[PDB]
Scaffold this active site. Structure first.
Site, PDB file in Angstrom:
ATOM      1  N   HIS A  68      39.067  40.371  29.219  1.00  0.00           N
ATOM      2  CA  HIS A  68      37.150  40.174  29.880  1.00  0.00           C
ATOM      3  C   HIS A  68      36.643  38.696  29.141  1.00  0.00           C
ATOM      4  O   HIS A  68      36.235  38.346  28.081  1.00  0.00           O
ATOM      5  CB  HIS A  68      36.502  41.620  28.933  1.00  0.00           C
ATOM      6  CG  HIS A  68      36.916  42.190  29.396  1.00  0.00           C
ATOM      7  ND1 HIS A  68      37.635  43.872  29.039  1.00  0.00           N
ATOM      8  CD2 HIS A  68      36.135  43.292  30.796  1.00  0.00           C
ATOM      9  CE1 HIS A  68      37.516  45.243  29.691  1.00  0.00           C
ATOM     10  NE2 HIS A  68      36.549  44.540  30.626  1.00  0.00           N
ATOM     11  N   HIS A 106      28.331  39.179  33.712  1.00  0.00           N
ATOM     12  CA  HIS A 106      27.933  40.479  33.062  1.00  0.00           C
ATOM     13  C   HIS A 106      28.829  41.243  32.490  1.00  0.00           C
ATOM     14  O   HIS A 106      28.913  42.049  31.614  1.00  0.00           O
ATOM     15  CB  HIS A 106      28.856  40.947  34.599  1.00  0.00           C
ATOM     16  CG  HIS A 106      29.994  41.518  34.618  1.00  0.00           C
ATOM     17  ND1 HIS A 106      31.288  40.846  35.077  1.00  0.00           N
ATOM     18  CD2 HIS A 106      31.190  42.272  34.442  1.00  0.00           C
ATOM     19  CE1 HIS A 106      31.955  40.712  34.948  1.00  0.00           C
ATOM     20  NE2 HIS A 106      32.203  42.116  34.472  1.00  0.00           N
ATOM     21  N   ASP A 107      30.140  40.063  31.703  1.00  0.00           N
ATOM     22  CA  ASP A 107      30.641  40.542  30.616  1.00  0.00           C
ATOM     23  C   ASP A 107      30.591  39.217  29.818  1.00  0.00           C
ATOM     24  O   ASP A 107      31.367  39.056  28.714  1.00  0.00           O
ATOM     25  CB  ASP A 107      32.508  40.683  30.547  1.00  0.00           C
ATOM     26  CG  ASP A 107      33.235  42.378  31.357  1.00  0.00           C
ATOM     27  OD1 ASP A 107      32.098  43.202  30.985  1.00  0.00           O
ATOM     28  OD2 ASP A 107      33.383  42.442  32.221  1.00  0.00           O
ATOM     29  N   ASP A 217      33.376  44.587  40.081  1.00  0.00           N
ATOM     30  CA  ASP A 217      34.327  44.539  38.132  1.00  0.00           C
ATOM     31  C   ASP A 217      35.769  45.203  38.580  1.00  0.00           C
ATOM     32  O   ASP A 217      36.352  44.864  37.070  1.00  0.00           O
ATOM     33  CB  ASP A 217      33.090  45.203  37.396  1.00  0.00           C
ATOM     34  CG  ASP A 217      33.560  45.082  36.221  1.00  0.00           C
ATOM     35  OD1 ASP A 217      33.942  44.272  35.476  1.00  0.00           O
ATOM     36  OD2 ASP A 217      32.813  46.202  35.280  1.00  0.00           O
ATOM     37  N   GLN A 269      47.265  55.244  35.605  1.00  0.00           N
ATOM     38  CA  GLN A 269      47.159  54.347  36.885  1.00  0.00           C
ATOM     39  C   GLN A 269      46.343  54.829  38.131  1.00  0.00           C
ATOM     40  O   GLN A 269      45.466  54.752  38.764  1.00  0.00           O
ATOM     41  CB  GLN A 269      47.912  52.819  37.756  1.00  0.00           C
ATOM     42  CG  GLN A 269      48.177  51.838  36.404  1.00  0.00           C
ATOM     43  CD  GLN A 269      46.353  51.283  36.491  1.00  0.00           C
ATOM     44  OE1 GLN A 269      46.301  50.838  37.209  1.00  0.00           O
ATOM     45  NE2 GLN A 269      46.076  51.577  34.954  1.00  0.00           N
TER      46      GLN A 269
END
Ligand SMILES: CNC(=O)c1cc2nc(-c3ccccc3)[nH]c2cc1NC(=O)c1cccc(C)n1
Ligand SMILES: [Mg+2]
Ligand SMILES: [Zn+2]
Length: 313
Positions: A68, A106-107, A217, A269
């Site tokens: 991030h 956004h982060d 994202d 995953q």
């Protein structure tokens, strides 16, 4: 005004494609972002001096965490650039301005921990913001940087346009809370199928922008396999650090955050691709047909994870 950013030939061509990787040269990422703003928005949208100062303050407020980080911010903004360029006529001048900035921001000031960890730790942010904790923080950080002297890239907008773009940015950043994605995509799925989806309805546009924010994202799962695989290491580096911090609070973490269960990552995953990624890009492709390459790349990566399980890699 006559000053353009121009990228080398390989980047100039590949930056237009959904599966573009921004590369390992950190000092080129600001220029890549400015290039995208200019082609997506115009050379007029922002005072280049104010934009450059905004970009460098945003970069400074991203932390040195495995996933991030500033590279993630620019990567997410590139996916939004690709969506916007393949859907030229669907988005207003304000939406294109807002969404590239929303993606870059956004982060902001992410610590590498989930909303869940903040709540269980009893972090001050969890007292201030009971839901979408980190996302309300990210928007707060965005407004703070916009209000630094010389950083108001929106100063040439009218009062009403300024309130609209900050509202576009707030909703876009809140929508990156994956907890809100499930219900948002279900509502969009119902609306598309019963034929009630209407892009002139603001509440409908808000939902579509929300899904685009989720799609951008998660775009790690839409790159070529070598990029997706190496990004997965960074994602799990954060998850396993969070799992370690859960164990320090005397709580067994969920398997995805437990480094003792590395072996079950490939199966983890599959669930993620089937429960989140594929559904996300399927609905986006239904609403915005030219985003089909994201769904195709996601399906290719699902098939690569299936091959890892079958022991072939
Ligand atoms: C909603 N479910 C998930 O987020 C998710 C659940 C998982 N469960 C496992 C797992 C299960 C058993 C053993 C070992 C691991 N791995 C997981 C990974 C996940 N997410 C991402 O990889 C990912 C990628 C990109 C962006 C984000 C936000 N997330
Ligand atoms: Mg986030
Ligand atoms: Zn993100």
């Amino acid at each position: 005004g006559l000053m353009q950013f121009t990228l080398p030939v390989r980047l100039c061509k590949e930056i237009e494609l959904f599966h573009f990787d921004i590369g390992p040269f950190e000092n080129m990422w600001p220029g890549i972002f400015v290039y995208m703003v200019h082609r997506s928005c115009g050379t007029s949208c922002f005072e280049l001096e104010k934009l450059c100062r905004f970009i460098m303050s945003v970069k400074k407020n991203y932390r040195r965490v495995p996933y991030h980080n500033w590279k993630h911010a620019v990567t997410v903004a590139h996916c939004m650039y690709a969506i916007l360029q393949n859907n030229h006529t669907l988005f207003t001048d304000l939406e294109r301005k807002g969404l590239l900035i929303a993606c870059l921001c956004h982060d902001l000031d992410h610590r590498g921990f989930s909303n869940s960890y903040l709540q269980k730790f009893d972090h001050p942010l969890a007292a201030l913001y009971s839901t979408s904790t980190m996302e309300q923080h990210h928007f707060s950080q965005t407004v703070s940087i916009l209000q630094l002297e010389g950083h108001n890239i929106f100063s040439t907008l009218s009062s009403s346009e300024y309130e609209q773009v900050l509202e576009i940015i707030r909703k876009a950043i809140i929508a990156t809370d994956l907890a809100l994605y499930f219900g948002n995509r279900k509502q969009l799925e119902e609306m598309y199928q019963t034929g009630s989806l209407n892009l002139n309805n603001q509440s409908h546009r808000d939902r579509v922008i929300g899904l685009m924010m989720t799609a951008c994202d998660l775009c790690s799962v839409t790159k070529l396999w070598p990029v997706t695989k190496l990004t997965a290491n960074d994602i799990y580096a954060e998850f396993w650090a969070e799992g370690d911090e859960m164990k320090k609070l005397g709580i067994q973490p969920i398997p995805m955050m437990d480094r003792d269960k590395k072996d079950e990552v490939p199966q983890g995953q599959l669930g993620f691709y089937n429960a989140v990624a594929i559904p996300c890009y399927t609905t986006l492709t239904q609403i915005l047909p030219p985003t089909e390459p994201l769904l195709k790349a996601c399906r290719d990566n699902l098939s690569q994870w299936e091959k890892v399980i079958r022991g072939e890699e």
